Amino acid sequence: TEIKRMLQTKEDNSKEQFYPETHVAGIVGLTEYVSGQLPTGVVSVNGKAGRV
């Protein structure tokens, strides 16, 4: 369970980190992460939120 940064060799001399694309179904803790987010202001009014 390590996070490895992929390195690729550029044309002249260098070796830069590059990122691969991921789908939203790929990340394994994304849904818990967005669930754990809490609104800053009033979360709910009289047990109701959103368009109040």
Binding site: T1, E2, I3, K4, R5, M6, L7, Q8, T9, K15
Partner: peptide
């Protein structure tokens, strides 16, 4: 490295 190689240096755990 080589021109066609790829790297897997580690960042976190």
């Amino acid at each position: 490295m080589e021109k066609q190689d790829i790297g897997l240096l580690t960042s976190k755990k």
